[PDB]
């Protein structure tokens, strides 16, 4: 639930990320997206 | 503005992830705690 909790803000960052990158332009940025998509794909697994 | 915004949602999951932590001894959050840390290091360049 705590875990749940945590999957919200990354789902949450996932979006604005996404929304910057069409904004901006920064690979850096499609960096972070990366990222932030393996840790919803990972907590994702730790929740059934 | 946005990579404030941005900003503010990484520090918000560093904590939250920091606490998890020591609640649940998880290695992969400790993975996710590395990422989300190395974000705000890379966000906080691109702010001055
Ligand atoms: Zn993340
Ligand atoms: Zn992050």
Same mark, same amino acid.
């Given at each position: 639930?705590?875990?749940? =909790?945590? /999957? @919200?803000l990354?789902? !949450?960052? $996932? &979006? !604005? +990320?996404? #929304?910057?990158? =069409? +904004? *901006? &332009?920064?690979? *850096? /940025?499609? @960096? $972070? /997206? #990366?990222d #932030? =998509? &393996?840790? $919803? #794909?990972?907590?994702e697994? $730790?929740?059934?």
């Amino acid at each position: 639930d705590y875990l749940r =909790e945590l /999957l @919200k803000l990354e789902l !949450q960052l $996932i &979006k !604005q +990320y996404r #929304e910057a990158l =069409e +904004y *901006v &332009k920064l690979p *850096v /940025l499609a @960096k $972070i /997206l #990366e990222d #932030e =998509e &393996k840790h $919803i #794909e990972w907590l994702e697994t $730790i929740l059934g």
